[PDB]
Write a protein that binds this ligand. Structure first.
Ligand SMILES: COc1cncc(-c2cnc(NC3CCNCC3)c3[nH]c(=O)c(C)cc23)c1
Ligand SMILES: COc1cncc(-c2cnc(NC3CCNCC3)c3[nH]c(=O)c(C)cc23)c1
Lengths: 130, 130
């Protein structure tokens, strides 16, 4: 219905705003675009579902997220990929893991403050009816 | 259930085999890998959901296709993207469009010959129950 289309449009507006705020944070530059294969040649083989903030924006615009829960799955994927690909004790690995956890924590904290629980419940109920 | 897992595993085996047969055809080399942005800088902006045969293989392996119908949507996407991005009368554009239609036609013809309709119906009924 028209009311449901308006609901998903509001969701997309909300998710774009959250994603933009993550993307302009200097700490998260490494997660903003797909990896350069020249910098990490084995990334494609080790990480089976790459994800980054530009890809998240494309998915929002393709109407791939019908709930904030589904969006957070991709944010969690950005984090889990980083922990998987950079598990070593070396400072470079530790920096990226810290930034990955910070990205995750920041996204969840924004959502906790700014997402109305009843709005999310509505989205979930519309999704389950499709 | 175990029987349903076996069904989706058989689907994945079937889809990998079809995709491999498309990927080794010389006509379809242009569709085997993501586009090189150096060759087509405006591709990212014009085509909103890029798709290629290596991406299709990754999606099979990530369990993204529960039916042949969903797989054919991505094959159709490879074709529609090509028709959209190369619409001109020039020979280069006409060649790619012809190959795109041939890819689509070939995938459908393989499926028509080799996919049991009752196998596809089972997949669809399992998908709809989830
Ligand atoms: C423009 O700079 C880059 C572009 N693309 C990828 C990276 C990058 C480089 N190194 C990583 N990890 C190494 C750190 C030192 N120990 C070996 C691994 C990276 N790890 C990542 O998770 C991502 C997303 C990029 C990246 C950088
Ligand atoms: C290694 O060669 C390539 C790598 N990546 C992309 C292409 C490519 C080049 N040109 C295209 N179309 C032009 C043909 C002449 N008129 C202007 C457009 C391409 N079109 C496509 O649809 C794809 C997938 C690649 C491609 C080639």
């Amino acid at each position: 219905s028209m009311q449901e289309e308006d609901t998903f449009r509001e969701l997309r507006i909300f998710l774009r705003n959250v994603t933009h705020r993550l993307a302009i944070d200097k700490r998260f530059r490494v997660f903003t675009k797909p990896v350069d294969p020249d910098e990490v040649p084995d990334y494609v083989t080790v990480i089976k579902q790459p994800m980054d903030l530009s890809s998240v924006i494309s998915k929002i615009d393709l109407h791939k997220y019908l709930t904030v829960k589904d969006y957070l799955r991709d944010i969690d994927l950005i984090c889990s990929n980083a922990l998987e690909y950079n598990p070593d004790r070396d400072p470079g690995d530790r920096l990226i893991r810290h930034r990955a956890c910070a990205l995750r924590d920041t996204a969840y904290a924004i959502i906790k403050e700014e997402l109305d629980e009843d709005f999310e419940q509505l989205c979930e109920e519309i999704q389950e009816s499709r």
